[PDB]
Amino acid sequence: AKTIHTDKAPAAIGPYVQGKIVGNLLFASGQIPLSPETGEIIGTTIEEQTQQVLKNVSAILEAAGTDFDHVVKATCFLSDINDFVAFNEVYKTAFTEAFPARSAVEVARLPKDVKIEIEVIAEIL
Amino acid sequence: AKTIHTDKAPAAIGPYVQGKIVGNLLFASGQIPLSPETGEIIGTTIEEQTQQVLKNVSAILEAAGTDFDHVVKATCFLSDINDFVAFNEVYKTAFTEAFPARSAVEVARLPKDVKIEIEVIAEIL
Amino acid sequence: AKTIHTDKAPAAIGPYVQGKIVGNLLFASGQIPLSPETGEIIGTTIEEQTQQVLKNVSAILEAAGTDFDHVVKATCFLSDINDFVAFNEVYKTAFTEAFPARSAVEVARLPKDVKIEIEVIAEIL
């Protein structure tokens, strides 16, 4: 029942919270390449948008007392599956040792027409 | 371990159950705006369909001994991302004290051509 | 947390793993109809591809110490919702004593243009 909020992640504008903790698990909301500072989309390419998504996720992971290496499951929504290789190159840089389980599919459309949205489930250390 | 069975949500037709509990977590099946009384799609708008999905989810939550305020994470599958404004206004009415984490994406198509499908993970107190 | 490695399922060559265990929950990566041996697509029809997915999922379940009857939640990604009826006819044969919670949507595109992808969460007894 613990709710996660941090200003270095985009503010939850809508009927949701950035993340919620139950027991040893963190359930984070899907993060899109939004700037927590400005409030608009960061990047016109899949590489630039993926990097901002990772910053948003890392901010939420930090605020909950965990890190990328302790993420358990990641779902990666792509607006175009042909971006996978370019996305995967930036996605791997968030992790040092351990890698989580992953699912990557192409959806019809993402909020604000972004190219990438990642939702994570992480273990609380 | 324990399966959820209630006549106040649409009947689980086929190889799935309305919900399953492990530990203190409820994993509810994705709910579509089906009427548990008639089996027909309720509503032709995103507002009317979302209201039926909330009723269906609420029945599963109640059968599991929890409520909307103890949902940890929700995933909302929409057929049209442009329904976001109207969807969020109805979706928010399900809650009394707190909002869960959430992801919302546009899929290509939903079962029975509905506009919304919501799956929830909830904490059992 | 432990990591699943099995030759009986397609190898996780990249920044991801076949599955990750936290507590009594197994979070498996989304599985596609890939041959663990040849690495090619197995099956031309939804029935044939689904059977290869079930084999891949079963391998991860067996490596984790669980089975289909202890899968808690399944999310099914279809490239065409019209295949959902045929999909369920093969999907049901994987379970004997209990059915898991399920969500199913039609996405815009799946990895390698497959027809079905299934991500499961299972309980480690």
- C117 to A107: CB separation less than 8 angstroms, yes or no: no
Strands (E), A1-125: 2-4, 19-22, 25-28, 71-78, 101-106, 116-123
First to last CA, chain C: 16
- Picking from A23, A19, A21, A121, the residue whose alpha carbon sits closest to that of residue A72 is A121
Resolution of the coordinates in A?
2.0
Based on C-alpha coordinates, what's the Rg of chain B? Answer: 13
Query: Of B23, B25, B72, which is closest to A20 when you measure between CB atoms?
Result: B72
A70: left (phi over 0), alpha (psi -120 to 50) or beta: alpha
> What is the homologous superfamily of the domain B2-123 according to CATH?
RutC-like (3.30.1330.40)
Beta-carbon contacts of residue B65 (< 8 Å; ≥ 6 apart):
B124, B125
A20, A23, A110: residue with CB nearest B101: A20
Could you state, in order of their start, the residue ranges of all structural domains in chain C?
2-123
Cβ distance A69 to A97 under 8 Å? yes
Q: Tell me the count of A-C CB pairs closer than 8 A.
A: 75
Tell me the C-alpha distance between A97 and C17, whole Å: 12
Q: Which of C26, C25, C88 is nearest to C57 (CA)?
A: C26
Residue that the structure tokens 């909830």 belong to: B122
Neighbours of chain C (3+ CB pairs under 8 A): A, B
Span between the terminal Cα atoms of chain A, in Å: 17
Distance, in Å, from the CA atom of B95 to the CA atom of A15, rounded to the nearest integer, reads: 9
Q: In what order do the strands lie in the sheet with C116-123?
A: C2-3, C19-22, C25-28, C116-123, C71-78, C101-106
**For helices A46-63 and A84-91, what crossing angle results, to 10°?**
40
Do the bridges between strand C2-3 and strand C19-22 make them parallel or antiparallel, or are there none, so unpaired?
antiparallel
The coordinates were experimentally obtained by X-ray
Chosen for mutation from C72, C81, C103, C109 (greatest number of chain A CBs closer than 10 Å) is C109
3-state secondary structure string across chain C: CEECCCCCCCCCCCCCECEEEECCEEEECCECCECCCCCCECCCCHHHHHHHHHHHHHHHHHHHCCCHHHEEEEEEEECCHHHHHHHHHHHHHHCCCCCCEEEEEECCECHHHCCEEEEEEEECC
What are the angstrom distances between the C-alpha of A57 and each of A50, A68, C4, C26? 10, 8, 24, 22
Please answer yes or no on whether C108 and A106 come within 8 Å at the CB atom.
yes
| A123 neighbors A36 (Cβ within 8 angstroms) | no
